[PDB]
Amino acid sequence: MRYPSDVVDQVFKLPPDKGLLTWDNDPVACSHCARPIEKGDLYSPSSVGAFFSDTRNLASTSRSICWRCLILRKKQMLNGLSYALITQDGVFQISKDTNKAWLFTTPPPAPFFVMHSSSTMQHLCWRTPVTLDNRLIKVRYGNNLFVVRPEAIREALEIADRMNEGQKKWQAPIFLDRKAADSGHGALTKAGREHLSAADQEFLLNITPGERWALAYIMHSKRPQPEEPECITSKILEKL
RNA sequence: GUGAGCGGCAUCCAAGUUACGCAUCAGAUUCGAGACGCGAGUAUUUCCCGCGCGGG
Numbered sequence A: 001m002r003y004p005s006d007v008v009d010q011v012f013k014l015p016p017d018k019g020l021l022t023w024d025n026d027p028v029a030c031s032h033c034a035r036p037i038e039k040g041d042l043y044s045p046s047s048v049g050a051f052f053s054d055t056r057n058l059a060s061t062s063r064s065i066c067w068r069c070l071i072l073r074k075k076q077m078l079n080g081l082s083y084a085l086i087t088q089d090g091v092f093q094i095s096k097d098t099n100k101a102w103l104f105t106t107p108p109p110a111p112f113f114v115m116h117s118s119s120t121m122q123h124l125c126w127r128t129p130v131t132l133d134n135r136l137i138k139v140r141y142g143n144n145l146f147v148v149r150p151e152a153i154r155e156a157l158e159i160a161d162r163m164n165e166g167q168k169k170w171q172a173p174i175f176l177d178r179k180a181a182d183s184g185h186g187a188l189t190k191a192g193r194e195h196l197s198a199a200d201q202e203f204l205l206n207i208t209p210g211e212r213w214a215l216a217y218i219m220h221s222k223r224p225q226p227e228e229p230e231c232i233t234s235k236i237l238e239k240l
Numbered sequence B: 001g002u003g004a005g006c007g008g009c010a011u012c013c014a015a016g017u018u019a020c021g022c023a024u025c026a027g028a029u030u031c032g033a034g035a036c037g038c039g040a041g042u043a044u045u046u047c048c049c050g051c052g053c054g055g056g
């Protein structure tokens, strides 16, 4: 899998819609997934409407949308892929905290896309870049493009465990917000400020925003136990 | 063509109501406007201070 639109024909196996124009000009990328639209490929002109708030994330100004993206842009597809992890095998739901911990500590090997909506409904799937290697996971949370490294997540979890192994009252070394919205997101808490060594503080201050967002779900007083998410592509196909 | 470019934390809200610086406490005890200015002592030079003259 190479493009976000590749999930349609590879895990949803949906044939293209009808009434679609056929490109008969010089190739140009899809305005959504940057996929080339060569001669003979089925496309459709852009008709996003006045409620499209993702003009900044458009891959190109070609005003053309491939059929895979047209399938992806359906309301049933948007709602189904709000908290979805699309691997080669199928589509899983990472909405639960345990699923997030499993994904960010024991990721699947194959290429996969990670989606997470920050609101009721958002355009995600055609914006998420593919994660080619599980060591450098690219996560699209709403409008933010996050890079999550599972090794850094594990190291931060170990740092917290060493910090709070003895004290009965568990305290978060770093202030984290699940929405990545608080003005104190990523700042060191007091307990971590005078209970962590210089190296651990330096490591905590030098984590990517995506790692802070992930730890905002995985790092708590009682760490969630990782579990495999349930397959969802059947539900999405049935509702489509 | 710096994962760039583009993007109002913004709108609305009474610190207010009620409350005695007040009650009590000698500026008192002693003592004169009534006393204080020379009619006090001889005759012509003696030791001396400034130097004929000032002066013990």
Ligand SMILES: [Zn+2]
Pocket (backbone or CB within 6 Å): A005, A030, A031, A032, A033, A034, A035, A065, A066, A068, A069, A126
């Ligand atoms: Zn596309």
